[PDB]
């Protein structure tokens, strides 16, 4: 059985009584968040705060897609948190693609594939993004990317394919929409790679359980948490706030 | 704030809930399996069911200790189940002092210690025991030995250490009793190592908080579960069950 | 008496021969081979053309061992030989541990252990690889394996166990350093296990005869059969060529 | 190109060398043998020693079109060389017919038809007569009858239709005439289907290369080898002698 988790709507919750009793922690940058230590919960809305930018997801995914370790091949402009987190060459470490479909990476996908197609009842379809150099990788060059991203694992239960993804950290308003985005188009490709293979296997998506070991949101981002408080809308303008 | 978790009891009556309705799972051994996928649970007990065996745990950390990869070098007569597990020379992956001491590991405990040494409040204080690599190194020489523990992420609030183990695969009867045992005494060395470092630190053990991709008990542990879900009792002999 | 067979050292004579003369056959996959059909010679050397790689042949052992039917238990990477010709679910025929130690495939190592003990004299000493239904059985769920070892038949004669290896088909580069270590070692290990029945049987490897339908060279390793056809060397390196 | 083969005139020599040297082996009746080992050559006559006896040979082609595996439906009276071999029923397993037309022996005749109709340079053109369960059947309900011939491939190289007959086991006097006479016939009928088939294919039979695990003479038949020895008559009566 699946465990019973906690809903996207009751980690809205748990983040709005830490806002309300000032429970912050310091980031590196100096800046407040408020935090949940050890969240899981069954990712079963796209975000938790925020708007859907599905233009810029497009771009991520274009550029996962390439598995370019350069923050200068993310189509169009770069966006400025990817610049402020590359080398001194532009080079980070968090491409997600690279991650999953690179041979350099061990071929992740194509292994956890190749597993679960010989053994739908595996335990060991795992995509391990995350490697044990990754604590003197993380500012190579002097970039400042530590994969947060540990692994993501994948069971199929019942002809339905579930991902639990296991974080390091995750920012709620920009990193789990985006993060998301990419773990949901994981797990639909890979339902429609195993379906291709065998035509009576009929696997179906199913839940994505997202485990993360610090789930924050930055102190610029508090006036979502505190309007969805008083109003339980999900979504201000800064300048209606 | 730490999250809201289920604790043991919690996952004894899951356990038996899945026993109660026979949903089981077929391991790659061809028996049997009850199974939570995507638990999440505040390892507030030592143990799920059976006896806590000490002689054993201390030859297991002896070993670990040792950093050896070769099953020969636990003291005294090597358990079976490593054995069986080992490649044609004796060898295996999972020696978790090999995954958290050795500098072919990227000293993973020492680098955690240092991170967190600096900066307290980092999410980056983790210890990686898994490789990108496993995808091919699991049958080794002809070894069955796929890592089941991921990362175990160590988070310092409030002056308590929390630990997030994340682990793919855990068997709940010997599994989840040695590997506990093993997680504590790292936290706890890490808790004594930050506290020598400074004296105004005074850092304190906090929880160790345990999510296991697939959480399971193999038939041949039915009636412990059993037994349990009748009287209450943890722990059976075989022959008085 | 054992027949007055050729040598490798002939055989090599004979395939350049056909290479010198164009004497060409058209492979299913469109692809040039050259080919001595009803080959018949005693193996006195471990390769015809091309270099041993012992690291291969000992990951092939260990598969064998396993007698498992899927190629991703083959450890490390499995070579892309072996995905290509797999079935959707990556499980092929000719794991040649299967023939020879599996009970479903009745036992064939044992039985003519059996036999042998018994009447060491015996005609009826024989391992059977492949099987009548191989002809509906060769591209199961898409694979493309039709077991090319037919049979191998033992023969006890002063005090020498001779084994008379009968092939179907036979690649002169990989197949045969391959397929050629396997059988010394299942020669040696069933000599060991007859001398460990008996000590004063004192029995000894004798000769391997290689009895192949069609013993091949593919087009892309011709470069290997004209050089040692102007220098004598077995071996270069494609790029030395 | 064809192997370099001996002939049957060279057989003859060694058979008669084998003689001379009294190198003996004893059968499992506890009679003597003459044997070459790891036989292969040519089948360039159509017996080696012995007379040419038509009429028992068109019995044996009758009983093996009708597939049965009963050897009171051998035409005419029953030799007695097949009642000491039935089991108590009187049933045997080497009715070659029964091996190749039999749909419970998978369609070996047709199947091989099939594979060289679609692909003439096919190496996986072979009817596969012998199976593994042959270590357990050979003796069911107290037969002695282990299947002598394993496979015989069929390689059609310049529109000559070649066959590769691989035998455990074959009596020089009464067995090889007798078996050569039914690969004769076999290969006839198979090079008039092929053309029957396609009239541009224009295919003839080939050379019929004999492959054979102990090639042997029956002490009672040593008379046959030594006049030969001797005179260079290839038969006597057993009063003339
Ligand atoms: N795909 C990504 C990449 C990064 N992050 C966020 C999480 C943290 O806010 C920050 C990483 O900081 P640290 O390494 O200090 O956790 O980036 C994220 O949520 N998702
Ligand atoms: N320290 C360890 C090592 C192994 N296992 C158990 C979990 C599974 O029962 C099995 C590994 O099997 P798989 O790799 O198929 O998950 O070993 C565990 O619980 N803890
Ligand atoms: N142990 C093996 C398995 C395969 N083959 C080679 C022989 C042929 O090159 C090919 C099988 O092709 P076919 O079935 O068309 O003969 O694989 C081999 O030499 N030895
Ligand atoms: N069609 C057949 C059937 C049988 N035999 C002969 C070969 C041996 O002389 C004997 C079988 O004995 P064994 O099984 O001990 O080899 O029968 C043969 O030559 N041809």
């Known amino acids: 059985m699946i465990s019973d988790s906690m809903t996207v709507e009751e980690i809205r919750l748990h983040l709005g009584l830490a806002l309300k009793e000032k429970d912050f922690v310091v980031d590196k940058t100096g800046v407040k968040t408020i935090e949940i230590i050890g ?6 809305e ?3 705060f925020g708007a859907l930018n599905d233009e810029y997801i497009q771009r991520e995914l274009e550029w996962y897609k390439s598995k370019s370790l350069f ?4 189509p169009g402009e770069t966006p400025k948190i990817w610049q402020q987190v590359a080398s001194s ?3 980070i470490n968090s491409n997600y693609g690279w991650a999953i479909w690179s041979e350099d990476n061990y071929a992740q996908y194509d ?5 679960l197609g010989q053994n739908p009842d595996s335990r060991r379809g795992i995509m391990i993004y ?3 150099s990754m604590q003197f990788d993380y ?9 947060c991203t ?5 069971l199929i239960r019942d002809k339905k394919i579930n991902a639990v993804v296991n974080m390091r950290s995750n920012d709620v308003v920009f990193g789990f929409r985006n993060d998301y985005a990419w773990q949901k188009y994981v797990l639909d490709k890979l339902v429609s790679d195993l379906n291709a293979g065998d035509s009576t296997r009929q696997y179906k998506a199913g839940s994505i359980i997202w485990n993360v070991g610090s789930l924050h949101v930055y102190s610029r981002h508090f006036y979502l948490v505190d309007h969805w408080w008083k109003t339980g809308e999900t979504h201000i303008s800064k300048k209606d706030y």
């Open 130 to 132: 995350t490697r044990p």
């Open 39 to 44: 969240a899981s919960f069954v990712a079963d």
């Open 89 to 91: 060459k532009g080079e």
């Open 71 to 74: 923050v200068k091949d993310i």
């Open 150 to 154: 540990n692994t993501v694992q994948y």
């Open 46 to 48: 796209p975000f938790i």
């Open 111 to 115: 292994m956890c594939l190749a597993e």
């Open 139 to 147: 500012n190579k060059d002097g970039m400042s990317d530590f994969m």
